[PDB]
Amino acid sequence: LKKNMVPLNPNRIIPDETSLFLESILLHQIIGADLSTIEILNRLKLDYITEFKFKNFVIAKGAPIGKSIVSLLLRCKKTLTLDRFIDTLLEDIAVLIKEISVHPNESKLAVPFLVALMYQIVQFRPSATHNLALKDCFLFICDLIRIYHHVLKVPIHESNMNLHVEPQIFQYELIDYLIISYSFDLLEGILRVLQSHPKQTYMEFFDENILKSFEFVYKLALTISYKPMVNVIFSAVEVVNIITSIILNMDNSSDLKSLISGSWWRDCITRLYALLEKEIKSGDVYNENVDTTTLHMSKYHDFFGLIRNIGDNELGGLISKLIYTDRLQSVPRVISKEDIGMFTAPIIGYKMEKWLLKLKDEVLNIFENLLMIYGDDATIVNGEMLIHSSKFLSREQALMIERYVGQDSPNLDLRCHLIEHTLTIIYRLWKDHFKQLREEQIKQVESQLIMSLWRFLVCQTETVTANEREMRDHRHLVDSLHDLTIKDQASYYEDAFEDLPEYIEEELKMQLNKRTGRIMQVKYDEKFQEMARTILESKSFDLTTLEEADSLYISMGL
Amino acid sequence: LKKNMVPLNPNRIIPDETSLFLESILLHQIIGADLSTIEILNRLKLDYITEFKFKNFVIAKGAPIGKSIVSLLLRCKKTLTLDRFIDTLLEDIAVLIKEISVHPNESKLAVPFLVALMYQIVQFRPSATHNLALKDCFLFICDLIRIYHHVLKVPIHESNMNLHVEPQIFQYELIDYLIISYSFDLLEGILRVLQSHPKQTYMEFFDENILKSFEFVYKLALTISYKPMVNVIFSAVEVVNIITSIILNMDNSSDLKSLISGSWWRDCITRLYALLEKEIKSGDVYNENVDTTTLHMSKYHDFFGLIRNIGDNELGGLISKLIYTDRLQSVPRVISKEDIGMFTAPIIGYKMEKWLLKLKDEVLNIFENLLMIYGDDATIVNGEMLIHSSKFLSREQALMIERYVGQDSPNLDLRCHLIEHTLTIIYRLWKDHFKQLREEQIKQVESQLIMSLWRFLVCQTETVTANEREMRDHRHLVDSLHDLTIKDQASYYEDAFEDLPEYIEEELKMQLNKRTGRIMQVKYDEKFQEMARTILESKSFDLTTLEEADSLYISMGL
């Protein structure tokens, strides 16, 4: 009688999730360092706080700090379940980071490793962390960054008499660069684990204090008059993405939007515009050059960080060489600043272009989001998304055609994805939001909008591709790198790319061909030809007159 | 239909027993030390083994050792289940103790803490440890002790010209005293966790090598011509107890007894006799006096150890003061030898008498066991258990009556339990083993046997107690300490001693009265009067003739 049902296991080992979390803390190790993070904190003392104690988390004067962390971890494993063990660790390590930070004399070497350890605590089980702990941790990291006021506020250019006679120390600069970078990365981590909660509970996180604190630290990160640290720019726009993504995908959308003032947005969007109008050039990414025009990713902060691996991690060997590893000390091991830098590969510049192109994709992606938040007209969906986005579209087509085609870099495709993306940021702005596209602001970009749409409608002629035989001879010229990519994907990393059945590689000699069309800047996708057609041709606004329009059409044929 | 059965739990949290074992290792702390054992091993390096590696247990030259222990513990938690995690730890820490030990120059400070950590590993779940690991660990601790050849072999008396001009260092002596004491305690622990296995599997432990190695180390512990360390005498007779206890309570009893040669027993029993004929005197327990007559428990090895808390732990403050606790070192922190010893309480002497009386109870308890092993006659159940046990019975009655009655020590009762026990070691020797009680050896003790039995049969007169009113006036004289004991037991530590229902304290004014009878050396228990009667009166052997017997009976009445 019903001999079908799947039988249970009578000895189900539900794994002790707090033990797995304990083990994930104990062997947490940042990428490039020689020792584990707890094993670094065992080698740190603090000799100006004579006795630290918050809630039975006693630290003696000459005691190792990581001894006290592992004593807390062992002591609170027996007692607490997981969601209490998390916020116990969060508030205890937060109070420790706090009184190491606000002190006149004491070195702050434990602070980066405690922030990274805190990030390991947060993102272990995001379903387990209650969001009031996330609120407390977010407020603590925001006013922790406003403690570290001076890392993101170095001036543009120094004095001419700034004599570089100096010990040329890097270890304190390396400490507070790690503090700022791990802090902004922890802000990104708090908001994605808050993003992963069920969608009825976001109001337990947000209040006025959250948004005012992030407004301050967001003005701090996306700087104007100071040297930009690009490591914090990635996370500081990814946080804005997480905000605009949960505003879309929640139910009580008004009480976020009522909590946000329009000044927050019109301070955010101008800095996003000023980020979007910067240049990406591989030959002087890592060079130090003119400000606020090239996203440059400085030599003196080049390491991975917590979420994503952003550079080549040139300063990861110096994290392990910041402590003496056989000694219990407080001041750092001395790192000379001018030893780094040795010249063999510009490929590092290509992948840093790849990250910066994903950054611009991120910025106009959150443009695409907050079009959909404020579908009705407001202060902020206000026509300058024609000006700045059309400037961006026109120049990233123009110097694509002038400079990039036939340069065999791997970053062509994504760079001709951005234009392919930002036309859509034009298009639904044109189609669904014309009621705020004012008559003067359209004439601020009448050159560049019409020229950018014309470089899509030039591709309806198509006397270039038309076959198969010579297009692969074009991709031997422009797209050999993606041939290497797809052969290494086909022979190693894809399940469907073996014993190819004479329909899966006819798809390949369809899609590599349309890809190399989209790279060669002739024959874009037909859907984008239609979207560019129904802005220029359509009669929502006289971009051109009919005797000016056919002056454009004769330069293709027509 | 059958709404009775107890329902299961659908979310049974079977606790991750290897995680609990991990946490028991990580907060293992010996009694009196300031730091945890892993936290002491984090402060130890080893600078003569340039690189230690056995099976991916890499230790660098200047690295902390406890870093490598906790790296093994975290790495082998994910992989192994519990019975493999145990013997992985056992062989790895054993190889580490080995190559720290066999080295000419290197200090051995890590060795006591690694042995104590190994003991914590063994006795956590004794059902989990497979007994081949116990065999390997027992063989390793036995040849580890024969490495430490010279701790248990200091001479009796030094030269007259042994000038005590010397650094007077104690730290190296404290190290290898801890090594020897923790090693013998680990031998006791291995054999009780082997005792706790199901009784069909003892042959997986024992072979010739086990018994030859313990024969050597047992001759080493119960010394003859060297200064005795009493800490190893307790465990070295408790091991013999565990052996003679499992020989009784197993099924394949012959293949142990065939594996044991009679020379092992007739080397063991002579040393047990020589231990049994020593004296216990509180006024010179802790004094240094004449050898092999007083069990003295020397001042320079007075700490707890692993199983039992044997002294007052005067050398436990010096275990934490053996390392610098803010430093990674190899040589010990210097302990001056003559600072210890400060005189306030002889009560410490009374509880050390209590432990030594339990030691003599242990020795004649294993006499009582191996009567029952060799119920048939052999080399070893051979009539000297009349001589030595009757010497012991007669003197511990004689100087009981001359010296101990009315001395208000807590150790009277157990001291008049020993006589009350050892009569039984007489009695079943007399009744069930007369066929080896040879005619000359009985006349070696004809004085002492008959006098000892007569001091039991003198109690059948009993004109002393006979009531209730004056016997409590006797226990105000001899047994006030047990009145304090039973009042503190009655008001604090016993569930049945409140709202006393006038039958539970009539039992008290029965059993305190028979107890103070048994202390006052008049009116023993009636069963012991019968057992002493049916040796003297019964006609198995002419102890007395009938004209010599009534010469004894007239000195009671009769």
Side-chain angles (χ1 to χ4, degrees), chain A residues 2-79 81-241 243-257 259-341 343-424 426-558, chain B residues 2-79 81-241 243-257 259-341 343-424 426-558:
Chain A
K2 186 67 178 176
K3 57 178 73 175
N4 295 115
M5 295 182 182
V6 61
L8 280 72
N9 195 4
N11 57 4
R12 293 179 295 171
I13 304 299
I14 296 170
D16 195 1
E17 70 274 16
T18 186
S19 68
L20 296 176
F21 176 65
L22 182 66
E23 190 179 5
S24 67
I25 293 172
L26 265 295
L27 58 85
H28 179 76
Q29 184 175 2
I30 59 172
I31 302 300
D34 293 332
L35 302 177
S36 178
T37 301
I38 299 299
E39 295 293 328
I40 292 169
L41 291 174
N42 293 120
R43 263 76 147 213
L44 295 177
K45 68 182 181 181
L46 72 168
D47 55 354
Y48 292 98
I49 297 171
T50 184
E51 191 273 332
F52 181 75
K53 183 179 184 294
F54 179 72
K55 291 180 182 179
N56 65 14
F57 181 68
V58 177
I59 300 172
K61 183 175 173 65
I65 299 168
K67 180 182 183 293
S68 296
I69 283 94
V70 71
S71 177
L72 178 62
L73 289 170
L74 294 170
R75 187 176 63 245
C76 193
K77 182 181 183 294
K78 291 176 72 68
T79 67
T81 184
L82 181 60
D83 58 354
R84 294 179 65 190
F85 186 71
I86 291 171
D87 59 357
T88 300
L89 290 174
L90 291 177
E91 66 180 0
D92 290 331
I93 296 171
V95 172
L96 181 59
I97 294 168
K98 183 66 180 293
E99 281 94 11
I100 295 171
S101 297
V102 288
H103 192 277
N105 297 115
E106 183 176 359
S107 177
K108 284 90 170 64
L109 199 155
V111 178
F113 299 105
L114 289 171
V115 173
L117 187 64
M118 185 178 289
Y119 179 73
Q120 181 65 42
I121 291 168
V122 171
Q123 62 91 32
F124 182 73
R125 295 290 184 271
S127 66
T129 302
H130 189 275
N131 53 4
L132 292 175
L134 299 177
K135 184 177 180 179
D136 291 331
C137 184
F138 185 81
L139 291 174
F140 178 69
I141 298 302
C142 291
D143 63 358
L144 180 63
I145 298 168
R146 78 178 64 247
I147 292 168
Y148 292 97
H149 187 76
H150 65 281
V151 175
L152 298 174
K153 290 185 181 293
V154 293
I156 297 296
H157 59 86
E158 69 273 16
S159 177
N160 56 1
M161 294 304 294
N162 202 166
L163 294 171
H164 297 285
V165 288
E166 187 67 27
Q168 297 292 320
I169 53 91
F170 184 69
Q171 68 271 16
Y172 294 98
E173 293 181 355
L174 184 61
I175 289 170
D176 57 358
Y177 289 164
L178 288 172
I179 294 170
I180 292 296
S181 179
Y182 291 161
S183 297
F184 280 97
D185 289 331
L186 181 56
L187 296 176
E188 180 179 357
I190 295 298
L191 283 168
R192 193 171 298 284
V193 302
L194 187 275
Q195 185 178 4
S196 67
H197 284 90
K199 69 181 182 68
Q200 294 83 16
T201 60
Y202 293 107
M203 291 299 292
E204 295 178 354
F205 183 77
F206 293 100
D207 63 356
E208 184 68 27
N209 196 3
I210 298 299
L211 293 171
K212 295 295 288 184
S213 65
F214 180 70
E215 184 178 1
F216 181 76
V217 77
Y218 180 77
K219 289 183 173 67
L220 183 61
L222 276 73
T223 183
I224 296 170
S225 65
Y226 296 103
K227 289 177 70 67
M229 183 177 175
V230 182
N231 294 113
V232 311
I233 294 171
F234 288 108
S235 62
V237 70
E238 184 69 27
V239 170
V240 181
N241 195 7
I243 293 170
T244 62
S245 179
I246 63 171
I247 292 169
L248 292 174
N249 296 113
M250 66 175 70
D251 55 355
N252 191 1
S253 298
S254 179
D255 290 331
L256 265 293
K257 293 187 287 184
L259 185 63
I260 296 171
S261 65
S263 67
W264 185 73
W265 293 110
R266 67 182 182 271
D267 292 332
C268 181
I269 297 299
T270 62
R271 294 179 183 270
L272 292 171
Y273 288 159
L275 184 63
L276 186 62
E277 289 180 351
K278 293 182 182 180
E279 294 178 352
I280 298 169
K281 301 294 187 291
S282 177
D284 58 356
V285 173
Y286 292 99
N287 192 2
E288 297 295 327
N289 56 3
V290 63
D291 55 351
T292 64
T293 60
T294 60
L295 295 173
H296 65 280
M297 184 66 201
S298 177
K299 182 173 73 70
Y300 296 103
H301 54 84
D302 191 0
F303 58 90
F304 281 162
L306 294 174
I307 293 95
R308 63 183 63 87
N309 303 117
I310 199 68
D312 57 354
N313 198 5
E314 195 271 331
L315 298 177
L318 296 178
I319 300 169
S320 66
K321 292 189 286 185
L322 189 64
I323 61 170
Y324 291 98
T325 196
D326 60 357
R327 187 178 293 171
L328 185 64
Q329 74 276 17
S330 178
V331 296
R333 184 178 177 181
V334 172
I335 298 169
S336 179
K337 189 171 75 174
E338 57 90 21
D339 60 355
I340 58 172
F343 62 96
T344 56
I347 305 300
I348 300 168
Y350 287 168
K351 64 177 70 66
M352 191 63 209
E353 283 186 349
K354 184 71 179 294
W355 289 105
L356 295 174
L357 292 175
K358 291 181 182 179
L359 180 64
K360 288 184 178 180
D361 194 2
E362 188 72 28
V363 173
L364 62 92
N365 205 165
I366 70 173
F367 287 167
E368 181 178 359
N369 287 320
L370 66 93
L371 291 174
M372 297 173 68
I373 296 171
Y374 294 97
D376 56 354
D377 294 330
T379 302
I380 61 169
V381 179
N382 56 2
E384 284 84 5
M385 290 181 183
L386 289 177
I387 289 94
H388 294 88
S389 65
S390 64
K391 288 176 72 68
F392 180 74
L393 175 59
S394 65
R395 64 98 178 271
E396 294 291 328
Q397 288 178 353
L399 51 80
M400 176 67 75
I401 295 169
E402 292 182 354
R403 299 293 296 163
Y404 286 105
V405 176
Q407 194 178 3
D408 68 4
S409 295
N411 296 318
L412 297 176
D413 184 75
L414 183 60
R415 190 181 292 273
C416 62
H417 185 273
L418 294 177
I419 53 95
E420 187 179 2
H421 188 189
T422 187
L423 182 64
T424 63
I426 298 296
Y427 178 72
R428 192 176 66 249
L429 181 62
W430 184 259
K431 181 174 72 69
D432 291 334
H433 293 86
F434 183 75
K435 276 74 68 178
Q436 188 64 41
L437 301 178
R438 292 178 66 189
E439 192 270 332
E440 180 66 27
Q441 292 176 355
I442 297 170
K443 288 184 178 180
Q444 293 180 357
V445 286
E446 185 178 1
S447 174
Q448 297 176 356
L449 180 61
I450 296 173
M451 186 66 200
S452 65
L453 297 175
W454 183 74
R455 293 184 187 272
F456 291 107
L457 274 73
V458 69
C459 295
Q460 67 182 357
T461 60
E462 194 268 327
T463 184
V464 176
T465 64
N467 64 9
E468 59 89 20
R469 178 74 271 174
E470 66 183 2
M471 294 183 74
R472 70 184 69 188
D473 293 332
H474 293 90
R475 73 190 179 187
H476 292 293
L477 294 170
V478 299
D479 190 70
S480 65
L481 274 299
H482 185 270
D483 288 330
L484 291 173
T485 295
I486 196 165
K487 289 187 263 75
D488 291 331
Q489 183 178 2
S491 64
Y492 296 102
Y493 294 107
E494 181 65 29
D495 295 332
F497 289 167
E498 64 181 359
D499 292 331
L500 283 76
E502 188 62 26
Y503 65 93
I504 204 67
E505 71 272 20
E506 294 292 327
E507 192 274 336
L508 294 176
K509 64 179 71 67
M510 187 274 287
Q511 68 90 25
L512 279 79
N513 288 113
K514 70 179 177 66
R515 182 179 175 88
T516 187
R518 192 267 306 278
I519 294 169
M520 283 169 66
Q521 298 295 318
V522 60
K523 182 69 175 178
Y524 289 104
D525 194 358
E526 294 290 327
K527 278 76 71 179
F528 297 98
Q529 294 181 359
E530 183 69 27
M531 283 182 281
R533 184 180 295 113
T534 58
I535 300 169
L536 189 149
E537 185 178 2
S538 180
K539 277 75 178 175
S540 178
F541 182 78
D542 51 354
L543 284 74
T544 61
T545 64
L546 73 160
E547 69 273 16
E548 291 174 353
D550 55 355
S551 177
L552 295 173
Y553 290 107
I554 53 91
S555 64
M556 289 83 78
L558 275 298
Chain B
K2 186 67 177 176
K3 57 178 73 175
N4 295 115
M5 295 182 182
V6 60
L8 280 72
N9 195 4
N11 57 4
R12 293 179 294 171
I13 304 299
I14 296 170
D16 195 1
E17 70 274 16
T18 186
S19 68
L20 296 176
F21 176 65
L22 182 66
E23 190 179 5
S24 67
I25 293 172
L26 265 295
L27 57 85
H28 179 76
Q29 184 175 2
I30 59 172
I31 302 299
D34 292 332
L35 302 177
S36 178
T37 300
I38 299 299
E39 295 293 328
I40 293 169
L41 292 174
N42 293 120
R43 263 75 148 213
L44 295 177
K45 68 182 181 181
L46 72 168
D47 55 354
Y48 292 99
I49 297 171
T50 184
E51 191 273 332
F52 181 75
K53 183 179 184 293
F54 179 72
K55 291 180 182 179
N56 65 14
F57 181 68
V58 177
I59 300 173
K61 183 175 173 65
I65 299 168
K67 180 182 183 293
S68 296
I69 283 94
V70 71
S71 177
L72 178 61
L73 289 170
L74 294 170
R75 187 176 63 245
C76 193
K77 182 181 183 294
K78 291 176 72 68
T79 67
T81 184
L82 182 60
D83 58 354
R84 294 179 65 190
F85 186 71
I86 291 171
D87 59 357
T88 300
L89 290 174
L90 291 177
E91 66 180 1
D92 290 331
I93 296 171
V95 172
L96 181 59
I97 294 168
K98 183 66 180 293
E99 281 94 11
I100 294 171
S101 297
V102 288
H103 192 277
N105 297 115
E106 183 176 359
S107 177
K108 284 90 170 64
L109 198 155
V111 178
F113 299 105
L114 290 171
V115 173
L117 187 64
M118 185 178 289
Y119 179 73
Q120 181 65 42
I121 291 168
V122 171
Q123 62 91 32
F124 182 73
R125 295 290 184 271
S127 66
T129 302
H130 189 275
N131 53 4
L132 292 175
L134 299 178
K135 184 177 180 179
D136 291 331
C137 184
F138 185 81
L139 291 174
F140 178 69
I141 298 302
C142 291
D143 63 358
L144 180 63
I145 298 168
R146 78 178 63 247
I147 292 168
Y148 291 96
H149 187 76
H150 65 281
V151 176
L152 298 174
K153 290 185 181 293
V154 293
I156 298 296
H157 59 86
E158 69 273 16
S159 177
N160 56 1
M161 295 303 294
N162 202 166
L163 294 171
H164 297 285
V165 288
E166 187 67 27
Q168 297 292 320
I169 53 91
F170 184 69
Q171 68 272 15
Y172 294 98
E173 293 181 355
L174 184 61
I175 288 171
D176 57 359
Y177 289 164
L178 288 172
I179 294 170
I180 292 296
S181 179
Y182 291 161
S183 297
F184 280 97
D185 289 331
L186 181 56
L187 296 176
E188 180 179 357
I190 295 298
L191 283 168
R192 194 170 298 284
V193 301
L194 187 275
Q195 186 178 4
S196 67
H197 284 90
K199 69 181 182 68
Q200 294 83 16
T201 60
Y202 293 107
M203 291 298 291
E204 295 178 354
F205 183 77
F206 293 100
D207 63 356
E208 184 68 27
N209 196 2
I210 298 299
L211 293 171
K212 295 295 288 184
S213 65
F214 179 70
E215 184 177 1
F216 181 76
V217 77
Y218 179 77
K219 289 183 172 67
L220 183 61
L222 276 73
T223 183
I224 296 170
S225 65
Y226 296 103
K227 289 177 70 67
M229 183 177 175
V230 182
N231 294 113
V232 311
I233 294 171
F234 288 108
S235 62
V237 70
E238 184 69 27
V239 170
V240 181
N241 195 6
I243 293 171
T244 62
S245 179
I246 63 172
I247 292 169
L248 292 175
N249 296 113
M250 66 175 70
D251 55 355
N252 192 1
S253 298
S254 179
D255 290 331
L256 264 293
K257 293 187 286 184
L259 185 63
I260 296 171
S261 65
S263 67
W264 185 72
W265 293 110
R266 67 182 182 271
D267 292 332
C268 181
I269 297 299
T270 62
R271 294 179 183 270
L272 292 171
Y273 288 159
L275 184 64
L276 186 62
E277 289 180 351
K278 293 182 182 180
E279 293 178 352
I280 298 169
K281 300 294 187 291
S282 177
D284 58 356
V285 173
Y286 292 99
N287 192 2
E288 297 295 327
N289 56 3
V290 63
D291 55 351
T292 64
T293 60
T294 60
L295 295 173
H296 65 280
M297 184 66 201
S298 177
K299 182 173 73 70
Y300 296 103
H301 53 84
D302 191 0
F303 58 90
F304 281 162
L306 295 174
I307 293 95
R308 64 183 63 87
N309 303 117
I310 199 68
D312 57 354
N313 198 5
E314 195 271 331
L315 298 177
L318 296 178
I319 300 169
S320 66
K321 292 189 286 185
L322 189 64
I323 61 170
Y324 291 98
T325 196
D326 59 357
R327 187 178 293 171
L328 185 64
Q329 74 276 17
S330 178
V331 297
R333 184 178 177 181
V334 172
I335 298 169
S336 179
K337 189 171 75 174
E338 57 91 21
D339 60 355
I340 58 172
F343 62 96
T344 56
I347 305 300
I348 300 168
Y350 287 169
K351 64 177 70 66
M352 191 63 209
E353 283 186 348
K354 184 71 179 295
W355 289 105
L356 295 174
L357 293 175
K358 292 181 182 179
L359 180 64
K360 288 185 178 180
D361 194 3
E362 188 72 28
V363 173
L364 62 92
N365 205 164
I366 69 174
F367 288 167
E368 181 178 359
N369 287 320
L370 66 93
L371 291 174
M372 296 174 67
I373 296 171
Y374 294 97
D376 55 354
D377 294 330
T379 302
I380 61 169
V381 179
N382 56 3
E384 284 85 5
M385 290 181 183
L386 288 177
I387 289 93
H388 294 88
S389 65
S390 64
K391 288 176 72 68
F392 180 74
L393 175 59
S394 65
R395 63 98 178 272
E396 294 291 328
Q397 288 178 353
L399 52 82
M400 176 68 74
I401 293 169
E402 292 182 354
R403 299 293 295 163
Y404 287 104
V405 176
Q407 195 178 3
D408 68 4
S409 295
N411 296 318
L412 297 176
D413 183 75
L414 183 59
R415 190 181 293 273
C416 62
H417 185 273
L418 294 177
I419 53 95
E420 187 178 1
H421 188 190
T422 187
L423 182 64
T424 63
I426 298 296
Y427 178 72
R428 192 176 66 249
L429 181 63
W430 184 259
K431 181 174 72 68
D432 291 334
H433 293 86
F434 183 75
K435 276 74 68 178
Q436 189 63 41
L437 301 178
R438 292 178 66 189
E439 191 270 332
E440 180 66 27
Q441 292 176 355
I442 298 170
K443 288 184 178 180
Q444 293 180 357
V445 286
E446 185 178 1
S447 176
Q448 299 176 357
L449 180 61
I450 296 173
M451 186 65 201
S452 65
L453 297 174
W454 183 73
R455 293 184 187 272
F456 291 107
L457 274 73
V458 69
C459 295
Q460 68 182 357
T461 60
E462 194 268 327
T463 184
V464 176
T465 64
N467 64 9
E468 60 89 19
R469 178 74 271 175
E470 66 183 2
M471 294 183 73
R472 70 184 69 188
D473 294 333
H474 294 90
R475 74 190 179 187
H476 292 293
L477 294 170
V478 300
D479 190 70
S480 65
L481 275 299
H482 185 270
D483 288 330
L484 290 173
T485 295
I486 196 164
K487 289 187 263 75
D488 291 331
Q489 183 179 2
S491 64
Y492 296 100
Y493 294 108
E494 180 65 29
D495 295 332
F497 289 167
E498 65 181 0
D499 292 331
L500 284 76
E502 188 62 27
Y503 66 95
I504 205 68
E505 72 273 20
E506 294 292 328
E507 192 275 336
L508 294 176
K509 64 179 71 66
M510 187 274 287
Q511 69 91 26
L512 278 78
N513 288 113
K514 69 179 178 66
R515 182 178 175 88
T516 187
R518 192 266 306 278
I519 294 169
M520 283 169 66
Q521 298 295 318
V522 61
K523 182 69 175 178
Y524 290 104
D525 194 358
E526 294 291 327
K527 278 76 70 179
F528 297 97
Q529 294 181 358
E530 183 69 26
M531 284 182 281
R533 184 180 295 113
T534 58
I535 300 169
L536 189 149
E537 185 178 2
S538 180
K539 277 75 178 175
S540 178
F541 182 78
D542 51 355
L543 284 74
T544 62
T545 64
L546 73 160
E547 69 273 15
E548 291 173 353
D550 55 355
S551 177
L552 295 172
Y553 290 107
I554 52 91
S555 63
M556 288 83 78
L558 274 297

